[PDB]
Coordinates of N, CA and C in Angstrom, one line a residue:
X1 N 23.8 23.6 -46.9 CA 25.1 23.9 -46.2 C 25.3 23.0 -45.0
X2 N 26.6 22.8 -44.8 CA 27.0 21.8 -43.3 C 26.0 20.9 -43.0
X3 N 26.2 19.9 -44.0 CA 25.1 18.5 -44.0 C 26.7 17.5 -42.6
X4 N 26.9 16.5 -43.7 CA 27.9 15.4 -43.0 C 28.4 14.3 -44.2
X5 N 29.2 13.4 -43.8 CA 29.6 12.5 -44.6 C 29.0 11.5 -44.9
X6 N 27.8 11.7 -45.5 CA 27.0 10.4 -44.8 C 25.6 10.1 -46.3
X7 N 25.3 11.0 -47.5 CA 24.9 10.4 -48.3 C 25.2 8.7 -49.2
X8 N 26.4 8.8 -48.9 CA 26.8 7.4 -49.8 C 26.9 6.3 -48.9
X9 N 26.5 6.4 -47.2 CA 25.7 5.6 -46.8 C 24.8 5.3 -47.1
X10 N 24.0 6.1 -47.3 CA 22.4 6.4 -47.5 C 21.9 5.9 -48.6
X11 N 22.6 5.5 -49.6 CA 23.0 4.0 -50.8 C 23.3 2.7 -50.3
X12 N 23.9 2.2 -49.1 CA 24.3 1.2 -49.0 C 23.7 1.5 -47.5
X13 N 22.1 1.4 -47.1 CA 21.5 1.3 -45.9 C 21.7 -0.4 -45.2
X14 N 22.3 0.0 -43.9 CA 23.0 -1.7 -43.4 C 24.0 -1.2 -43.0
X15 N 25.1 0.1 -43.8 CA 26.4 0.1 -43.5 C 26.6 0.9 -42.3
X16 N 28.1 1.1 -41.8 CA 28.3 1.7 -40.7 C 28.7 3.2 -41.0
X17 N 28.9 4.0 -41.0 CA 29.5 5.4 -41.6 C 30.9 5.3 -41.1
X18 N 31.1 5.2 -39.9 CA 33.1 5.1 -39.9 C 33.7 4.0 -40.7
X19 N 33.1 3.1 -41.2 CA 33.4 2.6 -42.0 C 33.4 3.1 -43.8
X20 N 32.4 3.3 -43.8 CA 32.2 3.8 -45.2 C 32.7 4.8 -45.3
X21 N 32.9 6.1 -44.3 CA 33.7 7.1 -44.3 C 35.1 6.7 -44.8
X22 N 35.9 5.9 -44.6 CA 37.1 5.2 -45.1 C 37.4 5.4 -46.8
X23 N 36.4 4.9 -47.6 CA 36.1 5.2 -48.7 C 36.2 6.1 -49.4
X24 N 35.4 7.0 -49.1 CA 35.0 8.2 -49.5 C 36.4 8.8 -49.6
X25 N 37.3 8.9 -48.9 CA 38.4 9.9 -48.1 C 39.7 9.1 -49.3
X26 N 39.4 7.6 -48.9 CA 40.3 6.8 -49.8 C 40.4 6.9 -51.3
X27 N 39.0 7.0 -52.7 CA 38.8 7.9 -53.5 C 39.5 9.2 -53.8
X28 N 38.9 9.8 -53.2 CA 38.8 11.4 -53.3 C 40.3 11.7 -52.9
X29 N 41.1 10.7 -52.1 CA 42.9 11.2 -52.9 C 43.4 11.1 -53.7
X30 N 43.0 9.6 -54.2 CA 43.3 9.6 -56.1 C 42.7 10.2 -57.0
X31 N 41.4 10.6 -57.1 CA 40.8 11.8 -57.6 C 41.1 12.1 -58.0
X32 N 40.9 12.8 -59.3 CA 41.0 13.8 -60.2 C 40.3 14.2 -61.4
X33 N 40.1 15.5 -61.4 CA 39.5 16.3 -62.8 C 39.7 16.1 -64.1
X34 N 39.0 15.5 -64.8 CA 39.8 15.4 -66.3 C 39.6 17.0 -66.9
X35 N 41.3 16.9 -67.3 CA 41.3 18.8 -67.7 C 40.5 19.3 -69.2
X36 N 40.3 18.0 -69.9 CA 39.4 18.5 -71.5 C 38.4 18.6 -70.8
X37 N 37.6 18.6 -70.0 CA 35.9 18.7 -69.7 C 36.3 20.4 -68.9
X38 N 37.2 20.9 -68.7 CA 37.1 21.7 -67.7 C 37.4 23.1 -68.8
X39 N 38.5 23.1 -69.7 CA 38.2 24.0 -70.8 C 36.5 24.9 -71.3
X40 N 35.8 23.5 -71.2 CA 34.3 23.9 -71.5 C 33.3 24.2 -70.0
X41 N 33.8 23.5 -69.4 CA 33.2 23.5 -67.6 C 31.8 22.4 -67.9
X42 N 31.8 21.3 -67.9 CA 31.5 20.1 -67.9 C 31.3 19.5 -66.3
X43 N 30.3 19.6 -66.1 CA 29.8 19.2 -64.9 C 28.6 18.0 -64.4
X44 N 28.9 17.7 -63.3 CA 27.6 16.7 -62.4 C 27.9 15.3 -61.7
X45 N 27.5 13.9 -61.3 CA 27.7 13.1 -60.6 C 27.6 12.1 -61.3
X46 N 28.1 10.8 -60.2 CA 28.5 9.2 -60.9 C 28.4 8.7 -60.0
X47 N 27.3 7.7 -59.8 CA 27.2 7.0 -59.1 C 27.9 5.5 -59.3
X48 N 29.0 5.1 -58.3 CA 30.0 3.9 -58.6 C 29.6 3.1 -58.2
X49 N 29.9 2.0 -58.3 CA 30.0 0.2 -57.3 C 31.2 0.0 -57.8
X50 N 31.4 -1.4 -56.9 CA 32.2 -2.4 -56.7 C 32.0 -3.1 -55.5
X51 N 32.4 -4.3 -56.0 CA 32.5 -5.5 -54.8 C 33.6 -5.9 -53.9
X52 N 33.8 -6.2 -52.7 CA 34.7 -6.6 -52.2 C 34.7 -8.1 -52.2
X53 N 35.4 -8.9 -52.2 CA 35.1 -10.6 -52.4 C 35.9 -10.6 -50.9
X54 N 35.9 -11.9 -50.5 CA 35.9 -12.5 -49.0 C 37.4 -12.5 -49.0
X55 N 38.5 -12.4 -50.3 CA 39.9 -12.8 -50.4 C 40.4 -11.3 -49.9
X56 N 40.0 -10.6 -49.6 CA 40.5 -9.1 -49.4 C 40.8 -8.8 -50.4
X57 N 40.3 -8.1 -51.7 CA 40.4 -7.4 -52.5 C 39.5 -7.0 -53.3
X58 N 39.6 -6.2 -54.4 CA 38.2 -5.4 -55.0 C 38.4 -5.7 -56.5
X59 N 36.8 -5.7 -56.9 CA 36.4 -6.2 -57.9 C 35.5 -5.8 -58.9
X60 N 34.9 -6.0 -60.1 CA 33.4 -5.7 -60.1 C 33.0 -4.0 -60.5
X61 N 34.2 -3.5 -60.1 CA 34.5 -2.1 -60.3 C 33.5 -1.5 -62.0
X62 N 32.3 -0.7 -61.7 CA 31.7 0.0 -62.8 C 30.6 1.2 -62.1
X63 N 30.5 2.0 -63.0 CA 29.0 3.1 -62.9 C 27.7 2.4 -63.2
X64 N 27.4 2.5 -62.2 CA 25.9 2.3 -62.3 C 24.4 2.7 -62.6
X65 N 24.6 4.5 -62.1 CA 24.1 5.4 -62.7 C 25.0 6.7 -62.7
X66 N 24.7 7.6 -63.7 CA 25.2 8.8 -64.1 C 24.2 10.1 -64.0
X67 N 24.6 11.5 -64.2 CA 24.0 12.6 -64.5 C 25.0 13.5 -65.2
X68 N 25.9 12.5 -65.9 CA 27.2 13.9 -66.8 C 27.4 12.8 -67.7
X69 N 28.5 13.7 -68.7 CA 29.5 13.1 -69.5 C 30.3 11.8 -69.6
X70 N 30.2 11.0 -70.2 CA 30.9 9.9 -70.2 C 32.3 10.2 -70.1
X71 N 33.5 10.7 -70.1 CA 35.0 11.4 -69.7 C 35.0 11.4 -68.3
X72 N 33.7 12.1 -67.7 CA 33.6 12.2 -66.5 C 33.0 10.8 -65.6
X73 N 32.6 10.6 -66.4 CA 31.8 9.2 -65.8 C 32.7 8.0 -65.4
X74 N 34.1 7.8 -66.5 CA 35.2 7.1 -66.6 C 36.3 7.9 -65.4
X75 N 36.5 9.5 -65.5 CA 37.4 9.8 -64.3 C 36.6 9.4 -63.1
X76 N 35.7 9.3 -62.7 CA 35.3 9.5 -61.3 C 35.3 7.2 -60.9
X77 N 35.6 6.6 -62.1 CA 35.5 5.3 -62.1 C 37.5 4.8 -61.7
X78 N 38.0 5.4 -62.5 CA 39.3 5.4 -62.4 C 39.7 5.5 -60.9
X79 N 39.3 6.9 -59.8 CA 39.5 7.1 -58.9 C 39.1 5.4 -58.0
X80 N 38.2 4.7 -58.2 CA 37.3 3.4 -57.8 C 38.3 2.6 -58.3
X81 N 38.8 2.6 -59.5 CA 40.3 1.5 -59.6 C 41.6 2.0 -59.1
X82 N 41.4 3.0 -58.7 CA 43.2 3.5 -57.8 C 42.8 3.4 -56.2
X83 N 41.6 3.6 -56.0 CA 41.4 3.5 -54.5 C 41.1 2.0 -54.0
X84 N 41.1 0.9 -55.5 CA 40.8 -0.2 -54.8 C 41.7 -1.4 -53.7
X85 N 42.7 -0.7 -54.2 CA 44.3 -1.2 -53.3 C 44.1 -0.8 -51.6
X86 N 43.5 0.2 -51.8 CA 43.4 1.0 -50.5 C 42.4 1.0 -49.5
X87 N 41.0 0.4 -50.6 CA 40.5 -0.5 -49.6 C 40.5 -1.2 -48.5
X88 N 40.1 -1.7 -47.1 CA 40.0 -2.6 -46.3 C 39.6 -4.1 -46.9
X89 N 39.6 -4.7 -45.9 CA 39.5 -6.7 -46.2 C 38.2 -7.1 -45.5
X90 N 37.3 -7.0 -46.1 CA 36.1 -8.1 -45.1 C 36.5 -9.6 -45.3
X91 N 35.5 -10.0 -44.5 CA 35.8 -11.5 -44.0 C 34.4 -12.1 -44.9
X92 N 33.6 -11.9 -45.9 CA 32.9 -11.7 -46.8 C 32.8 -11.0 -47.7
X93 N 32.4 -11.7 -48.8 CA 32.0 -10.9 -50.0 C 30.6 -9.3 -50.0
X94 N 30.9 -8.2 -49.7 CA 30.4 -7.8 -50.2 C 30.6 -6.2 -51.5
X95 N 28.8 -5.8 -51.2 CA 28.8 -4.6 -52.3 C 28.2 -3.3 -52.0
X96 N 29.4 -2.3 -52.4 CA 29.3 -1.6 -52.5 C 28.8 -0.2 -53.5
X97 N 28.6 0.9 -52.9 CA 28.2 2.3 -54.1 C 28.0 3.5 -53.1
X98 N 29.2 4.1 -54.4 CA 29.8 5.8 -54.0 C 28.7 6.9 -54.8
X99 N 28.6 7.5 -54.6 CA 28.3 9.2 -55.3 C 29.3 9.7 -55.5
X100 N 30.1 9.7 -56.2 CA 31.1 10.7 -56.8 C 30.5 11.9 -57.5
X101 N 30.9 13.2 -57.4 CA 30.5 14.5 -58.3 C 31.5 15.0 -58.6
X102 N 31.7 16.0 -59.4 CA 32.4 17.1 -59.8 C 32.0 18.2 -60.8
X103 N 32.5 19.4 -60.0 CA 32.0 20.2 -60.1 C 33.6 21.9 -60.1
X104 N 32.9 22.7 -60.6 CA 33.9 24.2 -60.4 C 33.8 25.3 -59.9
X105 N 32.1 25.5 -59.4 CA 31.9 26.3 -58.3 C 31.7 25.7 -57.1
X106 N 31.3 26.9 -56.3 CA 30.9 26.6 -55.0 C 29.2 26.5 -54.7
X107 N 28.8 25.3 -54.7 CA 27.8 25.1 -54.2 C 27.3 23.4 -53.3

């Protein structure tokens, strides 16, 4: 309980967390549940990448590793192609990786 926002730093050691916090926040409002997995309650995490290239914009976009359903593995990637507009611009190419989860209880 009451950790912080700061595991999917903890993937990409080097980064800044007010930065990377950007992300996270930017995701998780395009976000969403696919409703056939939820009928059954289909659960667990996705771990994402993508790259930024030096032109300001995003790239490269796929899962890298999983612990669920492929349905779910593709929603939590979709969120990674609608948040990529909403991304920031480096002045370099680089790469990134999210932990996305989903889940229906509380824990």
């Amino acid at each position: 309980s009451e950790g912080a926002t700061s595991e999917a730093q903890a993937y990409n050691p080097g980064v800044s967390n007010e930065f990377l916090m950007k992300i996270q926040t930017a995701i998780s409002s395009k976000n969403r549940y696919p409703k056939m997995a939820q009928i059954r309650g289909i659960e667990g995490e996705v771990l994402v990448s993508f790259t930024i290239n030096a032109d300001g914009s995003v790239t490269d976009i796929k899962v890298v590793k999983s612990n669920t359903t492929d349905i779910l593995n593709h929603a939590a990637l979709e969120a990674i192609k609608s948040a990529a507009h909403l991304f920031p611009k480096p002045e370099e190419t680089v790469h990134l990786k999210i932990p996305i989860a989903y889940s229906l209880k509380e824990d």
